[PDB]
Amino acid sequence: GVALGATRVIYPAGQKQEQLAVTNNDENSTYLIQSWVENADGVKDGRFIVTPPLFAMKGKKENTLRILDATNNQLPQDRESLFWMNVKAIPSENTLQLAIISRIKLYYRPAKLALPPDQAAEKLRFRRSANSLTLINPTPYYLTVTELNAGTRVLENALVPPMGESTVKLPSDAGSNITYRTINDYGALTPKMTGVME
Template identity: 40%
Template structure:
């Protein structure tokens, strides 16, 4: 058998599997981020199954920014079945371990949706794909000064070589929705930690920049107004 025929045969054998494959679509969250107010006993997140035929097994847990599952938060229920066209509420509870009270702390909420196996597909070649959704969890201590949705106005930008140091003097962690230097898109940008800073490379070929144009993601998951700030040397 020639190589071409072998490849064609392999492809045809895989077709039934590919046609049976489906993703764990239809699972939706009530928010794109969760703000845990420090003076509250818990925060919540609603998980909805918008598929009117398939049930899913839902697994939920918290991680820190390094991916460690040992955190001061517990999510309940950690594992449950979500029937077609149904909702369930996840409760995020702080276990009381000390966290900084002068700034926000950031964690991740993970929600994995595992599709159920029907009796009809039990003896068939079916590729089931578990889909994991990650949302940022911001622990916000009570009494922080200022307004979280205005904090981005206090960012400063300073060029150091081919990098721009972005400094955040506020107690709120900021995530960019867009950043450009002199009109050129800066690409992927990380979070600027509360009372911290990050370094962002200038776009390829740029040796300097005069202006940073940016917006951030607010508490509601939408983009803030666009702002221009000078890039200091």
């Protein structure tokens, strides 16, 4: 088994590295771990370095990956930028043997943002028309919106970009009131909040 120490990574501007833990809990398995970063389009652009980029986990061990910035301040300074951290575990008869890629969000966060991270959740707004619901995010943080309900009729999960919008499926046969939660920087659920229309 191969697990990551986090479901997302925040990389604040100016930081020299961020750590990501990788653990194997199986005494009899031996993997090649190959780790890299991609941009929102899923291309290896080279904005970040992972070290080590390739190594071998022999049994029950833990190795800390380190993600290094290589942007040189060329990313936006007003809002967060989305990247994807990838960790690929390859295990070393006519068998189909499988590799596991565990893939988490990597957020580049500029310094000196006005709104603090925690306050972003409650600023989320809504729009109820057609067979659709639009979510509105005026904050500079990517908001991962989960457990979205139209009454007790549960809807899709959404990822509302910073300073942007995101639309989901909606049936009018669902209930009246709206409620949601979000995944914060440490992977934890935020308190349930009342979905404010308009």
